[PDB]
Amino acid sequence: MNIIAILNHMGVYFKEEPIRELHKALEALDFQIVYPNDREDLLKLIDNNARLCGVIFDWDTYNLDLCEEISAMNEHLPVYAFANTHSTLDVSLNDLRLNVEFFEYALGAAQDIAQKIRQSTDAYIDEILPPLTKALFNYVKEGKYTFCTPGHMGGTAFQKSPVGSIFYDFFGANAMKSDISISVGELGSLLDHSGPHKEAEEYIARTFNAERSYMVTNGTSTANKIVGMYSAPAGST
């Protein structure tokens, strides 16, 4: 989630130079920059590449209807509009509903603008991730030492073995670090419907139009047996 599309290739130094400085500062912040040639190119780029996490364009060249077209494909995708001639009087209520952040052209402002864009990218990531998955990823980032199950202890045991190392290289570090148990209290408990798990369940029930929802980790075979045994006591038809 680190690709930033910069649309404009203008013909004035007072815009070109700040954009170049911003490109450098963003690349220092571990972003990959892409340069669509025109608006149709940008829209196709968005359509084909889900890792595109942001769009930079010049408000003078393109009106905010471009933001409408972008939002129709991804209403959460951050868009950064650089204002030169337009002012606060040039935005309507409908335009302000779009996820647009406004910047200005200035030499020496690339660092703070890049920091703002990094913050906005983190906000985008946070808003589209569901609660349990976000909590799991944050826990993995914390890098705690475990003396609890599972015994591989975040994949360390695999790394100590030749064949284990092959397995670890295949599945990757994150899959092993995320294999945890209820000894990690901050993630709550699936069986107890506690903490993030509870939020997850409610999230799921809202998305799937259910009053209540339960996640099952042994397939619809197990789901069927749960429903059936709750619903059909012995001796029933």
Ligand X SMILES: Cc1ncc(COP(=O)(O)O)c(/C=N/N[C@@H](CCCCN)C(=O)O)c1O
137, amino acid identity: F
Among 72, 209, 218, 228, binds its own copies (CB under 8 A): 218
Give the contacts of 84 (CB within 8 A, at least 6 positions apart).
Answer: 15, 58, 59, 60, 104, 105
- In the complex with ligand X, the residue whose CB is nearer, 32 or 224, is 224
Q: What residues are paired with 54 via a beta bridge?
A: 4
Near ligand X by CB under 6 A: residue from 32, 37, 63, 149: 149
Q: What is the distance between the alpha carbons of residues 54 and 156, in angstroms, rounded to a whole number?
A: 36
CB atoms within 10 A of CB 44: 11
The verdict on 221 binding ligand X (CB under 6 A) reads yes
Taking the complex as a whole, the smallest distance from the CB of residue 4 to its own copies amounts, in Å, to 12
Which residues, numbered 118-177, are part of the site for its own copies (CB under 8 A)?
Answer: 119, 125, 128-130, 133, 137, 142-167, 169-172, 174-175
Q: How far is the CB of 230 from its own copies (least distance, A)?
A: 7
Interface segment toward ligand X; rule CB under 6 A; list 71-79, 105-113, 168-176, 177-185: 177-185
- ∠ CA 227-230-232, nearest 5°, is 100
**Residue 223: both structure tokens together:** 């789901």
Q: Does the footprint of its own copies cover residue 189 (CB under 8 A)?
A: no
The residues that touch ligand X, with contacts defined as CB under 6 A, are: 148-149, 181-183, 219-221, 224
